[PDB]
């Protein structure tokens, strides 16, 4: 059934991915401030 067709969406979707890494770090710090429960 399935067939892999490469999608070079890496350079296309580069600003989306950049926001994700920043938020990964930022939600950690927000979590750290709340985990001092």
């Amino acid at each position: 059934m399935l067939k892999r067709f490469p999608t070079p969406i890496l350079k296309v979707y580069w600003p989306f991915f950049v926001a994700g890494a920043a938020v990964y770090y930022g939600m950690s710090k927000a979590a750290d401030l709340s985990s001092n429960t």
Partner: protein, 224 residues
């Protein structure tokens, strides 16, 4: 055991089955289940060919499609009368929305320099009120940041919580004897009407998600 993690896996397993076990022999006439996934594909093909309609409409069609299917399936999973929060874990949906907003702002900046901010002067208008219309254009630009996530999150969470609260009341309603359950069908019918509605408001929210983040992407991709 992390319930949220387990139901995210369950969503993944549902989606794999929809293009495999749904499909039955790579039919050229179309498998009965797989006919659904033709129609969804086409009404979103013609929607994002409509909405952004570039030469890269389809280049952002997978992104708009996995936001469709994620919300479409996770608003079946959240509808099970014995299942745990996903979208009602608001933090995943709102975080994802803010991420998409930041990835739009960055895309607009990347593609159109610092004259990306020329987007926020809306129209030719008298020069003494040109700066005002930048302040309350930029304000509206990151209102899209939280609006997109919070719309879906609130609807799914509130619906399930409403049903559960009415179910709990009907527990104490049925703790008044069966003669009250002569003419006592109406609160059950109210939860039923809501149960029909909660799938609906999730697919409508999924469509609203995917049409609005095509419109925002129209703004971000096409400067004016």
């Amino acid at each position: 055991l992390t319930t949220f993690s387990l139901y995210t896996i369950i969503v993944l397993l549902v989606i794999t089955s929809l293009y495999t076990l749904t499909n039955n022999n790579n039919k050229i006439i179309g498998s009965r289940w797989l006919i659904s996934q033709e129609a969804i594909y086409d009404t979103i093909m013609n929607m994002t060919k409509g909405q952004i309609g570039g030469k890269n409409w389809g280049l952002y069609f997978p992104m708009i499609f996995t936001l469709f299917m994620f919300i479409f399936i996770a608003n079946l999973i959240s509808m099970i009368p014995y299942s745990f929060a996903l979208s009602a874990h608001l933090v995943f949906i709102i975080s994802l929305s803010i991420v998409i907003w930041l990835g739009n702002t960055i895309l607009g900046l990347y593609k159109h320099g610092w004259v990306f901010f020329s987007l926020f002067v809306p129209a030719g208008t008298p020069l003494p009120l040109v700066p005002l219309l930048v302040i309350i254009e930029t304000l509206s630009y990151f209102a899209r940041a939280i609006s997109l996530g919070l719309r879906l999150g609130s609807n799914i969470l509130a619906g399930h919580l409403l049903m559960v609260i009415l179910a709990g009341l009907t527990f104490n309603f049925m703790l008044i004897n069966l003669f009250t359950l002569v003419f006592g069908f109406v609160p059950l019918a109210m939860i039923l009407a809501i149960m029909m509605l909660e799938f609906a408001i999730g697919i409508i929210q999924g469509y609203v998600w995917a049409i609005l983040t095509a419109s925002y992407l129209k703004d971000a991709v096409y400067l004016h």
